[PDB]
């Protein structure tokens, strides 16, 4: 943090979005997931600065140096996109590529299917391109699919925070884990009561993660806990009728889709088809990669990356 340079925009009155800025040229706004920061992109911020593009690895609403309103309602995709919007407008930015992994993804798919004309390309890390359905509710959907059963325990206000928030350490020691060193079970929540059982007090440390770069999502969540971060969850309903006001309007602008082979909740197998919304749809498969794309394998994404933006977003 010492050696970056952290910006702040007043996207609401309440409402100011933190994110560290490096390198010139073409804009390039990098979204994390969750539990993440912007800490996340560590490797990909001075390769892409080196490429010739002006990096901004934000902070997402309810994370880090971010602002984290309490409301539920204030973490729904339509807020959030126009919030980013927002953040182009008083940054003096007409466009910009917008790279998404995880709940990030999610943002960068819907930013560039209602607001194409401020988004140059899209890049999503794990994150699929899923048209919603009118006649499926959004909660028959979990449901269906046993891997997404930890989602259900995520929906009450307070529990799931109480369990992240006992021990910052225990939960990103858990967490960011690869997925041969992976302790956790996410169709066995809401069964046991918790996200963390076969975990113990204490957890080894993973070999892509140090104790430097543990404590410092520890410090960043210290800031605001994991309210702010577990309503991206609990706005299923609003996301869902805003994704079916868009049924008939496909994306145009170049995209590319980066699938992690080891990835057990947001499985290389859920983005098959995609190319029949397409619209230009490049892919990257990473062989060996779990869930943390970015802290499992940061070369490969790096490689894939520069490649992609070099020839479409330029
Ligand atoms: C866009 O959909 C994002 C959903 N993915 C999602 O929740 N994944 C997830 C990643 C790390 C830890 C936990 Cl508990 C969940």
């Known amino acids: 943090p010492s050696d970056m340079s952290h910006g702040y925009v007043t996207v609401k009155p309440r409402v100011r979005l933190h994110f560290v800025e490096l390198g010139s040229g073409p804009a390039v706004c990098l979204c994390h997931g969750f539990p993440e920061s912007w800490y996340s992109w560590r490797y990909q911020i001075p390769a892409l600065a080196q490429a010739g593009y002006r990096v901004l690895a934000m902070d997402m609403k309810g994370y880090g140096e971010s602002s984290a309103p309490p409301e539920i309602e204030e973490y729904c995709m339509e807020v959030l996109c126009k919030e980013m919007v927002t953040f182009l407008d008083k940054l003096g930015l007409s466009q910009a590529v917008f790279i998404g992994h995880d709940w ?13 004309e401020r988004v140059r390309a899209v890049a999503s890390l794990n994150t699929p391109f899923i048209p919603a359905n009118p006649n499926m509710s959004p909660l028959e959907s979990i449901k269906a699919n046993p891997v997404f059963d930890y989602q259900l325990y995520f929906q009450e206000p307070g529990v799931a925070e109480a369990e992240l928030e006992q021990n910052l350490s225990r939960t990103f020691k858990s967490l960011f884990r690869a997925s041969d060193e992976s302790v956790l079970s996410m169709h066995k929540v809401c069964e046991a009561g918790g996200l963390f059982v076969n975990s113990p007090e204490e957890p080894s440390l993973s070999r892509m993660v140090t104790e430097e770069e543990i ?4 410090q960043q969540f210290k800031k605001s806990g994991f309210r702010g971060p577990l309503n991206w969850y609990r706005n299923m309903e609003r996301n869902w009728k805003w994704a079916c006001k868009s049924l008939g309007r496909k994306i145009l602008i170049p995209a590319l889709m980066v699938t992690a082979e080891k990835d057990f909740v947001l499985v290389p197998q859920m983005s098959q088809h995609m190319e029949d919304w397409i ?33 479409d977003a330029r």
């Not at 990030?104 to 194409?116: C, H, Q, S």
């Not at 404590?215 to 520890?218: A, L, R």
């Not at 230009?280 to 779990?290: A, F, N, T």
């Open 104 to 116: 990030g993804g999610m943002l960068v798919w819907y930013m560039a299917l209602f607001y194409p």
């Open 215 to 218: 404590q410092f999502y520890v």
């Open 279 to 311: 619209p230009h749809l490049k892919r990257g498969h990473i062989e060996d990669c779990g869930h943390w794309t970015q802290m499992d394998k940061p070369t490969e994404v790096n490689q894939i990356l520069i490649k992609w933006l070099d020839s």
